[PDB]
Amino acid sequence: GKGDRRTRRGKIWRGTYGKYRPRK
Amino acid sequence: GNKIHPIGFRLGITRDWESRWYAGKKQYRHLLLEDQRIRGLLEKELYSAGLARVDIERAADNVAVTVHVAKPGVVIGRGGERIRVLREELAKLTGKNVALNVQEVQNPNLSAPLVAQRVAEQIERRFAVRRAIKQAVQRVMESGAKGAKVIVSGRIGGAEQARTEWAAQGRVPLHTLRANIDYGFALARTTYGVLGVKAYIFLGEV
Amino acid sequence: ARKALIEKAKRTPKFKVRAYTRCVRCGRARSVYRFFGLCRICLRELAHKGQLPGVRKASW
Amino acid sequence: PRSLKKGVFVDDHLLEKVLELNAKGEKRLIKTWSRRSTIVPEMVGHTIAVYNGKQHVPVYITENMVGHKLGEFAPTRTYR
Amino acid sequence: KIRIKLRGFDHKTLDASAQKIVEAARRSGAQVSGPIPLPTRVRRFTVIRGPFKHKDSREHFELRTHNRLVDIINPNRKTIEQLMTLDLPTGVEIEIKT
RNA sequence: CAGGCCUUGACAUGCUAGGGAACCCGGGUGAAAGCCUGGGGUGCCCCGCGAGGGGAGCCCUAGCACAGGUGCUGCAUGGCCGUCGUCAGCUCGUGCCGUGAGGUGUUGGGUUAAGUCCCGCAACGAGCGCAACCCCCGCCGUUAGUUGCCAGCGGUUCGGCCGGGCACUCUAACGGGACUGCCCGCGAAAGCGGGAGGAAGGAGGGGACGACGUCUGGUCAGCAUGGCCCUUACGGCCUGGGCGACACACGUGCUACAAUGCCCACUACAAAGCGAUGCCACCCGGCAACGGGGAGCUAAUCGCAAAAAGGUGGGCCCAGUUCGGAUUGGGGUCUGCAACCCGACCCCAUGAAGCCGGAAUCGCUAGUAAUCGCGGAUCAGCCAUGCCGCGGUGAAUACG
Ligand SMILES: [K+]
Ligand SMILES: [K+]
Ligand SMILES: [K+]
Ligand SMILES: [K+]
Ligand SMILES: [K+]
Ligand SMILES: [Mg+2]
Ligand SMILES: [Mg+2]
Ligand SMILES: [Mg+2]
Ligand SMILES: [Mg+2]
Ligand SMILES: [Mg+2]
Ligand SMILES: [Mg+2]
Ligand SMILES: [Mg+2]
Ligand SMILES: [Mg+2]
Ligand SMILES: [Mg+2]
Ligand SMILES: [Mg+2]
Ligand SMILES: [Mg+2]
Ligand SMILES: [Mg+2]
Ligand SMILES: [Mg+2]
Ligand SMILES: [Mg+2]
Ligand SMILES: [Mg+2]
Ligand SMILES: [Mg+2]
Ligand SMILES: [Mg+2]
Ligand SMILES: [Mg+2]
Ligand SMILES: [Mg+2]
Ligand SMILES: [Mg+2]
Ligand SMILES: [Mg+2]
Ligand SMILES: [Mg+2]
Ligand SMILES: [Mg+2]
Ligand SMILES: [Mg+2]
Ligand SMILES: [Mg+2]
Ligand SMILES: [Mg+2]
Ligand SMILES: [Mg+2]
Ligand SMILES: [Mg+2]
Ligand SMILES: [Mg+2]
Ligand SMILES: [Mg+2]
Ligand SMILES: [Mg+2]
Ligand SMILES: [Mg+2]
Ligand SMILES: [Mg+2]
Ligand SMILES: [Mg+2]
Ligand SMILES: [Mg+2]
Ligand SMILES: [Mg+2]
Ligand SMILES: [Mg+2]
Ligand SMILES: [Mg+2]
Ligand SMILES: [Mg+2]
Ligand SMILES: [Mg+2]
Ligand SMILES: [Mg+2]
Ligand SMILES: [Mg+2]
Ligand SMILES: [Mg+2]
Ligand SMILES: [Mg+2]
Ligand SMILES: [Mg+2]
Ligand SMILES: [Mg+2]
Ligand SMILES: [Zn+2]
């Protein structure tokens, strides 16, 4: 869920970007 | 713990800012500091003249500094040397090299800050507080003034227990926006402690 | 606002990070708005006196 | 999962001190107030008294201690 | 093609001192496309009422920057006559480009 | 808090006094602060050919008047705040009643969100409160076209991109509009019930606004301030530690326990805000944090930017799992003099408790609750899941 660093939603919640939430 | 400042409440309508100028985000804090130093130097000098207010305006490297005083004869000095020295201190503080003006206050008893300063003085001279208040309210009311109120804070009469003395008459509608109520505040530094003095004066409506 | 702590203003903080803002008026450390250079209390007081140009009470 | 960066940090107070020893010898102990300093191979075999905030603790350093800060070997709090 | 940006804390002062520029440029100049409002930049400051605790008090203030446009076509040299310096407003700041 | 130091001091004003004085650069020691030491340079005012003498500021030593204290007292206080309570109240002037404290008014009937209004009345009025004047959101208009639009035509690299135009959207100033004004019924009246027209009715929705006073309420640690107390330390500088301790107990929250769900891919709709030692388009390297390069933007014109839930397609098939991401090992990026104590972020591995929670207990009546994202203040960075704002989707129920 929103607490998983390795998930899209995890990134969105944590407000960061990365391998699991690209910047395109 | 209630009753917001009436001036601050009315700043949009029937009240206007003491400092009116525009500045950027990299500018504002500095010019504000300057204004503050100006008012701080002016109030600790011109007190004996009874300044009820200090207006400050700016465009570019120029500052209005319109000083409202009950007794302009004090700020003028002899032949105008006082205002010279004051402009000198002004230019020495801020290098902006700016102007100065003096506006007389007709009927100083119709301007709250002066009334409060009066009552404060009387209190510092060990007057009878209750009568000082009632008197002040009377003097304010007798000249124009559709309403008036004066409030003195605790340790009245040097008493061990703080108290609050009231004395208001006329109309003082603090909740009405169009009221146009002058407000003023003066301290009193005594041997036993400090007294707050508030002054409300209601003149006209729309 | 202890008087020695007003040593805050330093051309030589010895480090950029040791530099911290204070209230230019009362000397408050915490709650200092960068825009006004003031703290929050002074901010409200002066705002109420009308000494901050353009600053008005907000309602919506 | 720690990190620092390239250009590893060591305070130059003792950095020159330890190699100053190494030049002419071992000698005895040291007194260091900098616990923020990383451990480097040239320190191995020496003994460093590290300030825990109260006293100086005689930390002997070995080969497997390299890369940790001195302060890790000088615990600041007293518990039970 | 003279770009003008008028900024200030008083909508009255801006709006009134713009039409002065417009009327001054009407007689001596072109049709004067006239003030375009532009959006306002509102900066809010929320502050606790009390000096101690009481986190639920607040009463925030706002500081708003109004803007204006002008932008007179046909930069006539006859226009800068009534233009250049004649003005009432104090707390207005003016920007000008070509 | 431990340790190494400083004292007319980190800050203000003044006095006596020997001597040097404006000031610049070094060395020793040190964790830094500090202590010590050496070398450049002798402009001003007056007198004197000169040597030189005296002298103002300033700076260093010694002494004096003082600074300083986040040391105590919020029952010595100002100011400001919380609170009953946005509750419908609290009083005054004159008259009248009572020996008097006091009462009448302000009680009563009707009505209202309201001491709101009406009727009556030994009362007649009035003030602080209520309401209104202020702001935002709702419909329309005028003024204005660097935002908008094949509304309209011409061109189109078919992107409002070019020409072009203020009609629309929007932007932000002024103004209109709603007053039980109109109809029916009830009523003595104020008003109540319903209907028409209208974007909106009976206070249209939400803010700002909080009376006489109460709690010897909170704060001398934001500021101010009486009194008391310390003045080689209860003042001051620095290095390091601590405010981050952990057998435990409570409050407020976050993420969950899944299929009305989780994951991956593609695709669509917003508002309010911030941006020059700043936001950082786009290109390259990197799985990524991020690094290098670099356009634009004093910003309705560039950027943060991706909105998410939503829609389409596919995977999972009821299992502690493709639910849930704590804990821990390892490898890194960035800020910063410096991430051990004690930062956030990325990647690999790890994969805990948790199957909707005992007694008890909380919020909310409509665009509300629930749910989904977005921005900002402080700030180098950040322990923000906090606060203050913004919009998307959008319920249930109220007999009483
Ligand atoms: K009644
Ligand atoms: K309303
Ligand atoms: K009290
Ligand atoms: K449940
Ligand atoms: K959820
Ligand atoms: Mg998961
Ligand atoms: Mg008295
Ligand atoms: Mg102090
Ligand atoms: Mg800081
Ligand atoms: Mg700060
Ligand atoms: Mg590295
Ligand atoms: Mg409140
Ligand atoms: Mg003293
Ligand atoms: Mg108290
Ligand atoms: Mg108090
Ligand atoms: Mg207490
Ligand atoms: Mg108490
Ligand atoms: Mg009400
Ligand atoms: Mg309320
Ligand atoms: Mg009476
Ligand atoms: Mg009787
Ligand atoms: Mg009688
Ligand atoms: Mg009575
Ligand atoms: Mg009564
Ligand atoms: Mg009665
Ligand atoms: Mg009434
Ligand atoms: Mg009633
Ligand atoms: Mg009556
Ligand atoms: Mg319109
Ligand atoms: Mg523009
Ligand atoms: Mg435009
Ligand atoms: Mg038009
Ligand atoms: Mg009101
Ligand atoms: Mg704490
Ligand atoms: Mg324990
Ligand atoms: Mg034990
Ligand atoms: Mg507790
Ligand atoms: Mg883009
Ligand atoms: Mg790439
Ligand atoms: Mg555009
Ligand atoms: Mg689907
Ligand atoms: Mg599917
Ligand atoms: Mg798993
Ligand atoms: Mg289990
Ligand atoms: Mg299950
Ligand atoms: Mg249990
Ligand atoms: Mg139950
Ligand atoms: Mg309700
Ligand atoms: Mg931040
Ligand atoms: Mg943490
Ligand atoms: Mg956030
Ligand atoms: Zn302050």
Side-chain angles (χ1 to χ4, degrees), chain A, chain B, chain C, chain D, chain E residues 1-97:
Chain A
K2 298 176 195 168
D4 198 352
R5 171 207 245 176
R6 299 191 196 182
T7 55
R8 262 244 311 176
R9 270 191 203 173
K11 254 68 175 59
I12 299 183
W13 186 80
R14 236 166 162 181
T16 66
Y17 290 108
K19 175 185 183 179
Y20 294 95
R21 190 209 185 188
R23 289 174 170 265
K24 302 176 181 62
Chain B
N2 18 17
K3 290 147 173 296
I4 35 77
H5 192 130
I7 291 180
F9 183 41
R10 267 154 275 256
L11 278 181
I13 298 298
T14 75
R15 203 70 182 187
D16 286 271
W17 291 254
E18 300 184 17
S19 299
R20 41 233 186 179
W21 37 264
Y22 174 93
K25 49 192 174 184
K26 51 270 165 62
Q27 299 185 48
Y28 204 104
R29 58 178 183 274
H30 299 296
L31 312 187
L32 182 63
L33 212 187
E34 190 160 287
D35 290 22
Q36 212 61 21
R37 284 173 174 168
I38 291 175
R39 295 193 170 94
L41 181 59
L42 264 273
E43 285 172 3
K44 294 206 172 186
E45 283 290 290
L46 277 66
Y47 168 67
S48 64
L51 78 178
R53 195 177 175 176
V54 165
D55 292 32
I56 293 180
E57 316 172 27
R58 297 188 194 201
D61 297 340
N62 278 327
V63 193
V65 194
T66 317
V67 172
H68 292 257
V69 159
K71 306 166 56 58
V74 192
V75 306
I76 288 304
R78 49 143 208 173
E81 72 101 66
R82 173 83 177 187
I83 184 182
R84 165 84 163 188
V85 184
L86 288 181
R87 284 170 174 169
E88 196 68 29
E89 296 210 32
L90 160 140
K92 274 301 174 183
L93 174 61
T94 99
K96 320 297 181 178
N97 197 283
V98 306
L100 197 159
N101 288 279
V102 170
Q103 277 294 339
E104 188 181 1
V105 184
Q106 316 86 351
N107 189 9
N109 284 267
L110 260 192
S111 82
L114 298 191
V115 184
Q117 286 180 41
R118 192 70 181 89
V119 184
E121 280 187 3
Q122 301 195 25
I123 286 190
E124 292 195 35
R125 90 129 203 98
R126 302 135 188 283
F127 212 96
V129 181
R130 179 64 187 181
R131 198 219 277 100
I133 311 158
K134 278 158 72 275
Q135 276 183 347
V137 178
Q138 190 58 38
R139 302 194 315 271
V140 172
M141 273 293 290
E142 271 174 338
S143 44
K146 292 212 303 172
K149 172 181 292 177
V150 175
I151 295 169
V152 175
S153 69
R155 296 219 74 162
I156 297 180
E160 192 171 321
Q161 175 98 49
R163 304 192 298 97
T164 300
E165 228 75 296
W166 216 72
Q169 60 163 310
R171 300 204 309 138
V172 193
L174 298 199
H175 285 192
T176 298
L177 268 311
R178 57 181 155 178
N180 184 21
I181 302 175
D182 194 7
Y183 165 97
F185 169 68
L187 274 193
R189 302 187 65 193
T190 76
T191 318
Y192 40 84
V194 185
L195 286 258
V197 177
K198 292 190 179 80
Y200 300 81
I201 302 174
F202 167 67
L203 16 82
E205 196 166 348
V206 175
Chain C
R2 197 159 80 234
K3 285 303 175 178
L5 263 306
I6 327 287
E7 81 166 4
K8 177 276 284 195
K10 206 60 75 74
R11 273 68 174 273
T12 63
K14 181 193 249 298
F15 296 108
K16 193 197 232 303
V17 285
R18 298 203 171 180
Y20 62 90
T21 126
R22 283 186 171 276
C23 188
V24 67
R25 188 144 99 94
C26 77
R28 188 79 189 285
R30 300 183 145 98
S31 286
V32 271
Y33 283 72
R34 307 176 67 256
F35 184 91
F36 297 99
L38 296 164
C39 81
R40 70 157 202 269
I41 312 173
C42 299
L43 166 58
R44 202 170 82 92
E45 300 177 3
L46 294 178
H48 282 346
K49 311 183 84 155
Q51 303 192 12
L52 316 189
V55 174
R56 195 173 175 173
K57 275 185 56 57
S59 66
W60 73 105
Chain D
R2 329 173 190 172
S3 76
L4 289 185
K5 226 173 291 180
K6 38 87 203 316
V8 185
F9 182 91
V10 168
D11 231 6
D12 42 26
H13 309 155
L14 37 45
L15 176 55
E16 52 196 17
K17 172 75 66 53
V18 51
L19 51 86
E20 266 185 348
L21 301 185
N22 289 344
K24 54 107 164 297
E26 71 302 331
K27 206 197 166 187
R28 280 105 185 189
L29 288 168
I30 231 295
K31 277 186 178 177
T32 299
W33 277 249
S34 180
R35 29 164 52 232
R36 61 185 191 178
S37 51
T38 320
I39 280 180
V40 291
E42 26 272 350
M43 293 170 44
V44 179
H46 291 276
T47 312
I48 294 187
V50 193
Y51 203 57
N52 60 352
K54 182 177 180 182
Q55 293 180 338
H56 291 272
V57 293
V59 189
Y60 179 73
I61 150 177
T62 73
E63 184 76 19
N64 40 83
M65 294 178 46
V66 183
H68 301 267
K69 272 81 171 190
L70 293 163
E72 306 195 26
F73 299 88
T76 65
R77 289 175 244 259
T78 298
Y79 178 75
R80 235 90 186 193
Chain E
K1 42 184 180 178
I2 42 174
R3 172 181 283 189
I4 305 187
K5 256 189 173 64
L6 286 170
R7 57 193 76 263
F9 298 153
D10 196 347
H11 67 271
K12 276 207 51 188
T13 312
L14 277 183
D15 220 276
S17 61
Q19 296 184 5
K20 192 175 284 79
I21 269 64
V22 168
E23 288 191 48
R26 277 189 184 276
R27 318 146 188 168
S28 53
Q31 224 286 318
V32 185
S33 299
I36 319 177
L38 280 188
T40 307
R41 281 290 187 97
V42 178
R43 184 174 284 116
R44 294 206 205 285
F45 310 95
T46 301
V47 41
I48 307 177
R49 281 175 180 263
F52 196 80
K53 60 171 179 182
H54 295 142
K55 192 72 180 291
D56 284 328
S57 326
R58 302 323 161 115
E59 181 219 25
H60 26 241
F61 308 103
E62 73 182 15
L63 167 58
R64 45 181 39 189
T65 303
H66 314 260
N67 299 285
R68 299 296 163 208
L69 220 269
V70 195
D71 235 59
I72 325 167
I73 318 185
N74 286 126
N76 302 114
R77 293 167 47 79
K78 192 75 83 286
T79 307
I80 315 190
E81 267 73 291
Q82 296 187 67
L83 293 202
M84 197 55 255
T85 308
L86 298 170
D87 69 320
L88 298 183
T90 297
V92 165
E93 189 184 279
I94 319 167
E95 297 281 335
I96 284 182
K97 258 185 172 299

